[PDB]
Coordinates of C-alpha atoms in Angstrom, one line a residue:
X1 CA -17.5 -0.6 63.7
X2 CA -14.4 1.0 62.1
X3 CA -16.6 3.6 60.4
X4 CA -18.4 4.4 63.6
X5 CA -15.0 4.8 65.3
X6 CA -13.7 7.3 62.7
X7 CA -16.9 9.2 63.0
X8 CA -16.6 9.4 66.8
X9 CA -12.9 10.5 66.4
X10 CA -13.9 13.3 64.0
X11 CA -16.8 14.6 66.0
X12 CA -14.7 15.4 69.0
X13 CA -11.7 16.6 67.0
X14 CA -12.8 20.1 66.0
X15 CA -12.0 19.4 62.3
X16 CA -12.5 17.4 59.2
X17 CA -10.8 14.0 58.8
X18 CA -9.9 12.2 55.6
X19 CA -8.8 8.6 55.6
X20 CA -8.0 6.1 52.8
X21 CA -6.4 2.7 53.6
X22 CA -5.6 0.2 50.8
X23 CA -5.0 -3.4 51.9
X24 CA -2.9 -4.9 49.1
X25 CA -3.8 -8.5 50.2
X26 CA -7.1 -8.2 48.5
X27 CA -7.3 -4.5 47.3
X28 CA -10.0 -3.9 49.9
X29 CA -10.3 -0.3 51.2
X30 CA -11.3 1.6 54.3
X31 CA -12.6 5.1 53.3
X32 CA -13.7 8.2 55.2
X33 CA -14.3 11.4 53.3
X34 CA -11.8 9.8 50.9
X35 CA -13.2 11.6 47.9
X36 CA -13.1 15.1 49.5
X37 CA -10.3 17.6 48.7
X38 CA -7.7 18.5 51.3
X39 CA -4.6 20.8 51.0
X40 CA -1.7 18.4 50.7
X41 CA 0.9 20.7 52.4
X42 CA 4.3 19.0 52.4
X43 CA 3.0 15.6 51.5
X44 CA 3.2 17.0 47.9
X45 CA 7.0 16.7 48.2
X46 CA 6.6 13.0 47.4
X47 CA 5.2 13.8 43.9
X48 CA 8.1 16.2 43.1
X49 CA 10.8 13.8 44.2
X50 CA 9.2 11.0 42.2
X51 CA 9.0 13.2 39.1
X52 CA 12.8 13.7 39.3
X53 CA 13.2 9.9 39.8
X54 CA 11.2 9.2 36.7
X55 CA 13.5 11.6 34.7
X56 CA 16.6 9.8 36.1
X57 CA 15.5 6.6 34.5
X58 CA 16.5 8.0 31.1
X59 CA 19.4 10.2 32.3
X60 CA 22.0 8.2 34.3
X61 CA 23.9 11.4 35.3
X62 CA 20.9 13.3 36.7
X63 CA 20.8 12.2 40.3
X64 CA 24.5 13.2 40.8
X65 CA 24.0 16.6 39.0
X66 CA 25.2 19.5 41.1
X67 CA 22.8 22.2 42.2
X68 CA 24.2 25.5 43.6
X69 CA 22.7 26.6 47.0
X70 CA 22.6 30.2 47.8
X71 CA 21.5 32.3 50.9
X72 CA 18.7 33.7 48.7
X73 CA 17.3 30.2 48.2
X74 CA 16.6 29.8 51.9
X75 CA 12.9 30.1 53.0
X76 CA 10.9 29.5 56.2
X77 CA 12.2 26.0 56.9
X78 CA 15.4 24.5 55.4
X79 CA 17.4 22.4 58.0
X80 CA 19.6 20.7 55.4
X81 CA 20.0 23.3 52.6
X82 CA 21.2 25.9 55.1
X83 CA 24.2 23.7 55.9
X84 CA 25.3 23.9 52.3
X85 CA 25.0 27.6 51.4
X86 CA 27.8 28.7 49.0
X87 CA 28.3 25.0 48.0
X88 CA 26.3 22.4 46.1
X89 CA 23.9 19.6 46.7
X90 CA 23.2 16.8 44.2
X91 CA 19.5 16.3 43.1
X92 CA 19.6 13.0 44.9
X93 CA 20.7 14.8 48.1
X94 CA 17.8 17.3 47.5
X95 CA 15.3 14.5 47.1
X96 CA 16.6 13.0 50.4
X97 CA 16.4 16.4 52.1
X98 CA 12.9 17.2 50.8
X99 CA 11.5 13.8 51.8
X100 CA 13.4 13.0 55.1
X101 CA 13.6 16.5 56.7
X102 CA 10.8 18.3 54.8
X103 CA 13.3 20.8 53.6
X104 CA 11.4 23.6 51.7
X105 CA 14.5 24.8 49.9
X106 CA 15.1 21.3 48.6
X107 CA 11.5 21.0 47.4
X108 CA 11.8 24.3 45.4
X109 CA 15.0 23.2 43.7
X110 CA 13.2 20.0 42.6
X111 CA 10.3 22.0 41.3
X112 CA 12.6 24.5 39.5
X113 CA 14.6 21.7 37.9
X114 CA 11.4 20.1 36.6
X115 CA 10.2 23.4 35.1
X116 CA 7.6 24.6 37.7
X117 CA 4.6 23.3 39.7
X118 CA 2.6 22.5 36.6
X119 CA 5.2 19.9 35.6
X120 CA 4.6 18.1 38.8
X121 CA 0.9 18.0 38.0
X122 CA 1.6 16.6 34.6
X123 CA 3.7 13.8 36.1
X124 CA 0.9 12.9 38.5
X125 CA -1.4 12.8 35.5
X126 CA 1.0 10.5 33.6
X127 CA 0.5 8.0 36.5
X128 CA -3.3 8.1 36.1
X129 CA -3.8 10.5 39.0
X130 CA -6.6 12.8 37.8
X131 CA -7.0 14.5 41.2
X132 CA -3.6 15.8 42.2
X133 CA -2.7 19.4 41.5
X134 CA 0.4 21.4 42.4
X135 CA 0.0 25.2 42.0
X136 CA 2.6 26.9 44.1
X137 CA 6.1 26.5 45.5
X138 CA 7.1 26.2 49.2
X139 CA 6.1 27.6 51.6
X140 CA 3.0 29.2 50.1
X141 CA 1.5 25.8 49.1
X142 CA 0.7 25.4 52.8
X143 CA -1.9 28.1 53.2
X144 CA -4.6 25.4 53.2
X145 CA -7.5 27.8 53.0
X146 CA -10.9 26.0 53.2
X147 CA -12.4 25.5 49.8
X148 CA -9.3 26.6 48.0
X149 CA -8.5 24.0 45.2
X150 CA -4.8 25.0 45.0
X151 CA -2.3 22.4 46.0
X152 CA -4.9 19.8 46.9
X153 CA -5.9 16.1 46.3
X154 CA -8.2 13.5 47.9
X155 CA -7.2 10.8 50.3
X156 CA -8.1 8.0 47.9
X157 CA -6.3 9.5 44.9
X158 CA -3.2 10.0 47.0
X159 CA -3.3 6.5 48.4
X160 CA -3.8 5.0 44.9
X161 CA -0.8 7.0 43.6
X162 CA 1.4 6.2 46.6
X163 CA 0.7 2.5 46.1
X164 CA 1.6 2.8 42.4
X165 CA 4.8 4.8 43.3
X166 CA 6.1 2.5 46.0
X167 CA 4.7 -1.0 45.3
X168 CA 3.4 -0.8 41.8
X169 CA 3.9 0.3 38.2
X170 CA 4.9 4.0 38.3
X171 CA 8.7 3.8 38.5
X172 CA 11.6 1.6 37.4
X173 CA 12.9 -0.9 39.9
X174 CA 16.0 1.0 41.1
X175 CA 14.1 4.3 41.5
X176 CA 11.1 2.6 43.2
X177 CA 13.5 1.2 45.8
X178 CA 15.1 4.6 46.2
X179 CA 11.7 6.2 46.9
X180 CA 11.0 3.5 49.4
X181 CA 14.4 3.9 51.0
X182 CA 13.8 7.7 51.4
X183 CA 10.3 7.3 52.9
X184 CA 11.5 4.7 55.4
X185 CA 14.2 7.1 56.5
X186 CA 11.9 10.0 57.2
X187 CA 12.7 11.7 60.4
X188 CA 9.6 13.9 60.8
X189 CA 6.7 11.5 61.3
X190 CA 7.3 9.9 64.8
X191 CA 4.1 11.3 66.3
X192 CA 1.8 10.8 63.3
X193 CA 0.8 7.5 61.7
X194 CA 3.8 5.7 63.1
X195 CA 2.6 6.3 66.7
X196 CA -0.6 4.4 66.0
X197 CA 1.2 1.3 64.8
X198 CA 2.8 -1.7 66.4
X199 CA 6.4 -0.6 67.1
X200 CA 8.2 -3.2 65.0
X201 CA 6.2 -2.7 61.8
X202 CA 8.3 -1.3 59.0
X203 CA 7.0 2.0 57.8
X204 CA 7.9 4.8 55.3
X205 CA 6.0 8.1 55.3
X206 CA 5.8 11.7 54.4
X207 CA 4.2 14.3 56.7
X208 CA 2.8 17.8 56.0
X209 CA 1.6 20.6 58.2
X210 CA 0.2 24.0 57.3
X211 CA -2.3 26.7 58.2
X212 CA -5.9 26.0 59.3
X213 CA -4.4 23.4 61.6
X214 CA -3.9 21.2 58.5
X215 CA -2.1 18.0 59.6
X216 CA -1.3 15.3 57.1
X217 CA 0.6 12.0 56.8
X218 CA 0.9 9.5 53.9
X219 CA 2.5 6.0 54.6
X220 CA 3.4 2.6 53.2
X221 CA 3.3 -0.1 55.9
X222 CA 4.8 -3.6 55.9
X223 CA 3.4 -5.8 58.7
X224 CA 5.4 -8.8 59.9
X225 CA 3.1 -11.5 58.5
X226 CA 0.8 -9.7 56.0
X227 CA 0.8 -7.9 52.7
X228 CA 1.6 -4.1 52.7
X229 CA -0.9 -1.4 53.7
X230 CA -1.0 2.0 52.1
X231 CA -2.5 4.7 54.4
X232 CA -3.4 8.4 53.9
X233 CA -4.6 10.4 56.9
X234 CA -5.5 14.1 56.2
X235 CA -6.9 16.5 58.7
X236 CA -7.9 20.2 58.6
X237 CA -9.8 22.8 60.8
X238 CA -12.0 25.8 60.3
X239 CA -9.8 28.5 61.9
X240 CA -6.6 29.8 60.4
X241 CA -4.3 29.7 63.5
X242 CA -5.6 26.3 64.8
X243 CA -2.9 24.1 66.3
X244 CA -1.7 21.1 64.3
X245 CA -3.0 17.7 65.5
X246 CA -0.6 14.8 64.8
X247 CA -2.4 12.9 67.6
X248 CA -5.5 12.6 65.4
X249 CA -3.5 10.9 62.7
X250 CA -2.0 8.4 65.1
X251 CA -5.5 7.7 66.4
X252 CA -6.9 7.2 62.9
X253 CA -4.0 4.9 62.0
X254 CA -4.7 2.8 65.2
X255 CA -8.4 2.5 64.4
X256 CA -8.0 1.3 60.8
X257 CA -5.0 -1.1 61.3
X258 CA -6.7 -2.6 64.4
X259 CA -6.5 -6.4 64.9
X260 CA -4.7 -6.7 61.5

């Protein structure tokens, strides 16, 4: 069965697998360790970008607001912001950069605009997400130490919230469409969930990778002849310098979207 397949996948993997799939046709779920906490790593960037989108609903000038980028703002991984040092980027452009290129500088600018990590947590709570917590900025939010509660959530909680964000009640229509547009245009997720799906299915996703071989992806999936699917695949390992394992995410995705 699907459960037996996920079990067999995890047992050979050398780590701990978390899966939550929501089928919006009938709200049915496929769950594996879905109530267990995992370090989000860069999948947390979705929540920060969405918090700014929510603000923009009541401030029509916000998304085009200029943000100065400086050399000092650059951190371990910032492919887009490094192009704009000495100039500016709009908050919209920073959302796009954070979500589609996993730009760490962009993420931090979004957090600083909002007033710090705790403000991203409060936003998640306003959406009925009682699990999500953001504690640190980038890149330290990727330390993914086993048993550390900082910057974690559960697969189910994140799947529920991603559904609410992309297909449900969380955002205004224009902003919801913008989030969906951003996720669909992600460039960093080829080898993760996307690689376990039929090639012509439309997909939006956000990856995240960190220490302890922590390898994550969260996605919204639109089949050709069926209602959407929301999928969270989280994976983490016992040793600090373990290699990341996108291949496990692709394999989980294939297992739980089988036949369907």
